[PDB]
Design a protein around this ligand. Structure first.
Ligand SMILES: O=C(O)C[C@H](NC(=O)c1ncnc2[nH]ccc12)c1ccc(F)cc1
Length: 167
């Protein structure tokens, strides 16, 4: 038993809620919150800008040190950093950004990173301003992630569409 509230069950291992992921993180303090990052960990907008703002820019400061030491991530890759005031850890996961012309085929690889963690609070990878089809992304999530994932969807209309179309 865990401490997430009001989530809708989709499969053996995936739940979903129309909620602000920052507020879900501040309430639950999960072991892992997932960020929808880019390879440079430049947290400008979307999930990343929202999470980083909630950390008072501490996420960005930590991320800049990470990049200075290690270089950029791969599209499809991830790194574990601090969750700051939001979670124990933040799993920064790079899905493909279709508005950058990146390969949507790497979405499955991106979701595979979730399998290294027993329980995660996460956004829908590559959706929103990342420009991929959100129905497709939820499908890839359910067909790839085997650990327990709690998906938080900001946009109400998107949430309603995702639930009503889910197979
Ligand atoms: O769930 C959604 O609507 C889409 C989601 N966006 C957000 O979660 C979001 N965007 C802007 N400001 C925000 N503030 C608090 C949350 C938040 C998203 C998912 C994958 C991405 F690669 C990029 C965005």
């Amino acid at each position: 038993v865990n401490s997430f509230s009001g989530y809708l069950k989709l499969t053996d291992n995936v739940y979903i809620k129309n909620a602000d992921i920052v507020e879900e993180a501040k309430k639950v303090k999960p072991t892992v919150v997932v960020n929808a990052a880019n390879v440079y960990l430049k947290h400008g907008g979307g999930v990343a800008g929202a999470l980083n703002k909630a950390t008072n820019n501490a996420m960005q400061v930590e991320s800049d040190d990470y990049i200075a030491t290690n270089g950029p991530l791969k599209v499809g890759g991830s790194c574990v950093l601090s969750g700051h005031n939001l979670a124990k850890h933040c799993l920064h996961v790079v899905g493909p950004n279709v508005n950058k012309g990146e390969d949507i085929q790497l979405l499955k690889s991106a979701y595979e990173n979730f399998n290294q963690h027993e329980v995660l609070l996460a956004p829908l990878l590559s959706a929103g301003i990342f420009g991929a089809d959100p129905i497709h992304s939820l499908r890839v999530c359910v067909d790839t992630v085997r650990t327990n994932v709690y998906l938080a969807v900001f946009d109400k209309n998107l949430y309603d569409k995702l639930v009503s179309s889910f197979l």
